[PDB]
Amino acid sequence: LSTAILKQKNRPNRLIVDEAINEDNSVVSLSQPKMDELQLFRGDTVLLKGKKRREAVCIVLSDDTCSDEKIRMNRVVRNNLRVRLGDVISIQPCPDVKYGKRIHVLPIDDTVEGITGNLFEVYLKPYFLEAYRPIRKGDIFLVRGGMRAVEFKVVETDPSPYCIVAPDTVIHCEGEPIKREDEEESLNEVGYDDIGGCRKQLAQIKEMVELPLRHPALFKAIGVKPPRGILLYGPPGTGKTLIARAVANETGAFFFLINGPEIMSKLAGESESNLRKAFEEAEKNAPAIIFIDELDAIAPKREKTHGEVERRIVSQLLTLMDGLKQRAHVIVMAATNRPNSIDPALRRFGRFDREVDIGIPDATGRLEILQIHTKNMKLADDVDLEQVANETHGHVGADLAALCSEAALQAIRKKMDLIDLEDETIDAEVMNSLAVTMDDFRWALSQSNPSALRETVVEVPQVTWEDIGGLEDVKRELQELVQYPVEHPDKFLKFGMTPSKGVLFYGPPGCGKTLLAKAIANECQANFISIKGPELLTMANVREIFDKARQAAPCVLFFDELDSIAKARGAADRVINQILTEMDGMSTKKNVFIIGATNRPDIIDPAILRPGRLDQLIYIPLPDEKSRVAILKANLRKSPVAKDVDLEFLAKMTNGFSGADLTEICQRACKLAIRESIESEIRRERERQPVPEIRRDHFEEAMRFARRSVSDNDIRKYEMFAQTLQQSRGF
Amino acid sequence: LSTAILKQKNRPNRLIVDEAINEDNSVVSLSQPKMDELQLFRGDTVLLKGKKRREAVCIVLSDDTCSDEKIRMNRVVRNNLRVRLGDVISIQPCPDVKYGKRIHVLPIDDTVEGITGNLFEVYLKPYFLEAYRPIRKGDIFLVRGGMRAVEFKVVETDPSPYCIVAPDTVIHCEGEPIKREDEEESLNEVGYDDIGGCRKQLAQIKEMVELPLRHPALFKAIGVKPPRGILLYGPPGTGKTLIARAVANETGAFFFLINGPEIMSKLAGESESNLRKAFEEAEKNAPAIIFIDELDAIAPKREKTHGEVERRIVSQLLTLMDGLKQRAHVIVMAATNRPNSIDPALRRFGRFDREVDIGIPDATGRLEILQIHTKNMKLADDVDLEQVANETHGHVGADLAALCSEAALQAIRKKMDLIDLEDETIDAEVMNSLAVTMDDFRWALSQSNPSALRETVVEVPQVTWEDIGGLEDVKRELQELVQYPVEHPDKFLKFGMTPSKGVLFYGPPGCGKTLLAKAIANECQANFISIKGPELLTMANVREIFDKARQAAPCVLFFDELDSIAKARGAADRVINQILTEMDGMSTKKNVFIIGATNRPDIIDPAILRPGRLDQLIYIPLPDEKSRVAILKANLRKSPVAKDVDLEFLAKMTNGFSGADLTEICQRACKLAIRESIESEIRRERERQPVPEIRRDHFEEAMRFARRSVSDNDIRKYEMFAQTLQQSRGF
Ligand SMILES: Nc1ncnc2c1ncn2[C@@H]1O[C@H](COP(=O)(O)OP(=O)(O)OP(O)(O)=S)[C@@H](O)[C@H]1O
Ligand SMILES: Nc1ncnc2c1ncn2[C@@H]1O[C@H](COP(=O)(O)OP(=O)(O)OP(O)(O)=S)[C@@H](O)[C@H]1O
Ligand SMILES: Nc1ncnc2c1ncn2[C@@H]1O[C@H](COP(=O)(O)OP(=O)(O)OP(O)(O)=S)[C@@H](O)[C@H]1O
Ligand SMILES: Nc1ncnc2c1ncn2[C@@H]1O[C@H](COP(=O)(O)OP(=O)(O)OP(O)(O)=S)[C@@H](O)[C@H]1O
Ligand SMILES: [Mg+2]
Ligand SMILES: [Mg+2]
Ligand SMILES: [Mg+2]
Ligand SMILES: [Mg+2]
């Protein structure tokens, strides 16, 4: 699997956190059989490994009420490891823990507000009375005393980082008290759990970055060289910088961060000095990561660049990238939202040759993002994040963070009648009551302008075969053309046939060509890329479409509305010839399928049909009576149709209708039902100051206005091309 | 021959390595007749020359069990020469070897891990006890002693580089111990054996570079001046830098390396200083090579350049190139992947006038690359590198190195369930078991995006006359037009006729024009360049195509789908007029053949047909019955067709079918067989929870759906142009 690196090892050292019974900050309880397997004894000091490299040293005890697979700890231990209930930790024996020489501690500010008592005497001394509590640098623990308990932070240890607080150890609380904001900033460090919708890409990053650095011998043994340069790219706001901070906070390697604007804001000469210093300091620390965020800020195309300093930065960076000895254990990551603006010399072998695409999240990916962002918001109980994830079509992670911000602001606007902008301090009874409801999310949805609306979406469609009425033969052909070479490639090797990767749908308008392309991509669970003819004529970029379909294989590359390009024949001639050239180079990829659709088969370019490009000509015809019943059933699945409606009769009397004409009939019936329902409630309001389902009368009224969208002469010509389209090339 | 310089001289001094019997690190055994021919005696110290200029001094002995053509040595001697079993060395008498004054040695780190004993006393003294072992600087030898033997490196010799370790010689092991990584980096130096698919180009480089430098008198005697500038060019990743390191590590000349980005990363003034210093230091060392890697980094087109410093670098380089006295014995090599971005003044006589094209490797060349890269990988036994070489179509050497990396990573992913990313050290039982299987290579193939897919391939096609059915007369014409002027030029001089270098294939679509062009290029063993019409209309660059066909002569330059250009008549007018101009200038090359194909002969530009451009008009017609049998046989060669299938009957009932229509019939039959086979196995799985060959029923079902791709009126018009196409020019 591609995500095997992210899988939990499920070792016995892994344990699940539980709610403590009597265990204080410095002890943890386990089941006795667990120590028997782990050979742990009583009174042993143990080391806990958690999230974001956080550590803790505590005492392991025996619990007869502890589960085998779980560990016992209080909320303080759960806090110090950045772990939560239900999360997994690791445990290992901790030897060589010596008595503390001197521990430097300090309290949290908001705990010692208004308190003038001696912190050491009143709080620290009783808590450290012969208990032999093991502590580590950076730990936070709650100490009772006085009217209110105060938390303290271990800022320095003698020795570091583990020590035992003996009664002979010197405990001192001098120094500037620790602000809660300082600990709060460290509490909310980014981790791999703060990225949603990037599970596959996070697996790639771990293999490319964390594996060659933690286990360089694993690559020397298999006799391969790991990459030195990783280029994260994607649209703006998709979380490349967020992944940078996640790797910064959850890697064992030394991490150096370079900002593009930071480097180029410096004078001519301090930029190169800072670049050289970054790579030098990364080589001094053996396993290191250099992240160059906004790579295209410092390394644009040398052909398209005016200043001398910009060109000297790019050459300096190329030199430093080439100067990595491959024995230095330095990996250079970079992020960019304009991957094609980067100097081509920086994307070669040995320099940023591996690329990770942090693309647009899909509906489930962006539901995961929404849960991450709302995880600390005060949500109401009626808010359905699954729904919000479904309407947020063109949103990226930053668009969803902005959407949650706007929802919170709408919630505040509903409470401004209770607050004032000029209060010295806000009311206390409005904070606890302040919650974001699903209505605020609907409002924020109506006002959000996504930044990723105008760019190609590559995802499995939700259109299913059940959305299509009839075309059972075409469904069989499409399965045998798109699914068999992908699912049973050995069959195609047995008979020596190579599969054809192209299909042309043609026929009258509104008969289901677009639905068929999406439905076959959905059944095969293949990514779907749709490029309408108008999008091509308003566009170098055809090359990016085919490259995008190559990266996302198995893919169905749909070229819809080819008739729009054909009518434009100029720019349309270049577009078609580019597409033909790409389809010739595309034959290598055995799992990218190209589909074209046109309802003007008389003007299609004959070269499109050459054996090897789109030689499978499938004719989607105007639906017959049985298919019309099926179309009407398929369109009305989401509608409450009353049982007296005879779809058999509706399909009998609509003779030359398309699938889209039948959809328009159902649309009119819903419009009549909505009008009747709206009139009914206005009449009720009129008297005070119904229409649950679409009935047969609505379909009668809607159908006497039915207009047939394909002429009889049109049907004749389409039937003629059903026989003579393969002959269109030649004369 | 063009590769005569690479041929082994097969001198008596050449010997084949053998597995030692009793020979230790300082002795080598030979057959007694070999010394009789070589006049070598017993106890003589001898010098061994191996790969990458490595040397060794040892003692020659007499072996009655040694072959005449082979030499005896242990693994230590085999290691010190960078030679392997089956490889050839050279031998010569070594006189004037004096006693050592002081030899500075040091051990390898991993050999002395955990060992605190005295290296000299325990190891070095017993091994050097009166044995009079001859040693050289940089030698590595294994010395027994203690619980574990330790290897030592000779870092300095008094005198250098040969010395005799007398008992009176001072042996000392002080100094920082030698890391194995340091020796490992020197072990894996690049040599001419680390380049695959460039045998012809390596021969060119040796003649242009290593011959004028080793034997300048050989050029003064024949009265010619050797070139001073060699330009390696090719697509990115094709191994130009690799050849640079190979020449650096396997030439007797002083080698200076200049990096384009290195030079231009310096300040305005240190760049010119570094260039001048490089050429000065190359002239101080008499036979020298200056390699300027990434030439286009420092020397772009002065017309297309903005900075003043860039233009001063180009002028500085032109001055230095012109300043080579031709008596300095300095050769300047350069590499570039944009040979047309270089200043035209640098490709003139006396400056980079010789060019070597490190092009795309072909199937056998890239099999050689794959063997080089996997030679230290742990491959399984089922991996077929010949197959991988066949699917990797658009790959260059760097794409194949990346492909082997991805295969190794897939192998690791299959073993992550046994390893952990957080282990302090990896498991030992998973390394030895970790091997790359052919399944990992198929996966890496499915994910590889080659960088050389979108560029012209120049190679001999695999299409053979047996792939074509019928057209026996056309095959005779093509042989008499393409093969006779190449194979029997004296015949064409006898009769005073000059051959015509152009052919126009025309006729109905799908009748074999593309196959005929590839088949004649394959029979003549000529390079084949194909330029489809769409590729031209999406493109200065026509000039590069004809230049590329001129460099690769004997070549068949195929202009396929000329009908696509004709229908576009603009950009198409410029393309045709450019092609016509090139065909006029192309008549000089007597061994570049141009072929055009069109299935719209009614709109071909009449100037194409002028006597001297494409005046040979060959009409490929719609196949007759006998040819249809031949086409069906040719298409089904790779398919398991059952014997009851009557191809004679199939061809009888398909009357007006093209070659491509018959191929489509065979494709449908294979699709029906695949569907039946897939249904059969699903039925077997259905009952548990066949179709070995295509039978006559499949061809019956497939043929009732057969559609004829050429109309009867189309056939009439094509037959009319079979008589009146030469008349198309004039009115
Ligand atoms: N995949 C994601 N998961 C969770 N939060 C995300 C994700 N992507 C974006 N966000 C949020 O959006 C914010 C902005 O994302 P960034 O990390 O700046 O994206 P970006 O790749 O840097 O885009 P740029 O810098 O404009 S090219 C982050 O701080 C997160 O709060
Ligand atoms: N066979 C069908 N089954 C169900 N709904 C259909 C069918 N054909 C058309 N429709 C409906 O009519 C709409 C027309 O879209 P399609 O027919 O898939 O695209 P089309 O064939 O290119 O025709 P266009 O887009 O109007 S030119 C669909 O979105 C459906 O709502
Ligand atoms: N012909 C070849 N034989 C063997 N290995 C090769 C060959 N070509 C490339 N490689 C491998 O691929 C790597 C990349 O080759 P390079 O030397 O970078 O090619 P290149 O010509 O320098 O391309 P540039 O520098 O981007 S223009 C080499 O280090 C080898 O490991
Ligand atoms: N005479 C033939 N013998 C064998 N196979 C043939 C023959 N003619 C056509 N084919 C098959 O049909 C395919 C069509 O390719 P060609 O006929 O060589 O190209 P063409 O003549 O330019 O016609 P196109 O490419 O369809 S416009 C070939 O790749 C073969 O698979
Ligand atoms: Mg950013
Ligand atoms: Mg549509
Ligand atoms: Mg290079
Ligand atoms: Mg062809």
Author numbering:
A (entry chain F), B (entry chain A): 12 to 550, 557 to 586, 595 to 714, 727 to 768
Task: Tell me, in the authors' exact words, what the paper reports.
P97 (also known as valosin-containing protein (VCP) or Cdc48 in yeast)1 is a highly abundant cytoplasmic protein in eukaryotic cells. Similar to many AAA + proteins, p97 converts chemical energy from ATP hydrolysis to mechanical forces, which then relocate or unfold ubiquitinated substrates. In vivo, p97 functions as a homomeric hexamer, a 540 kDa molecular machine with twelve copies of ATPase domains organized into two rings. p97 plays a central role in cellular proteostasis.
Our work started with the structure determination of p97 in complex with the cofactor Npl4/Ufd1 to reveal the difference between the yeast and human systems. We determined the complex structure in the presence of ATPγS using cryo-EM and single-particle analyses. Using 3D classification, we resolved three different conformational states of the complex. A homology model of Npl4 was built based on the crystal structure of the thermophilic fungal homologue. p97 adopts a six-fold symmetrical conformation in all three states. In fact, when applying a mask around the D1 and D2 rings of p97 and imposing a C6 point-group symmetry, the resolution of the 3D reconstruction improved to 2.8 Å, which allowed de novo model building. A comparison between our model and the published human p97 structures suggested a very similar conformation to one of the ATPγS bound states (PDB accession code: 5ftn15) with an overall root mean square deviation (rmsd) of 1.095 Å.
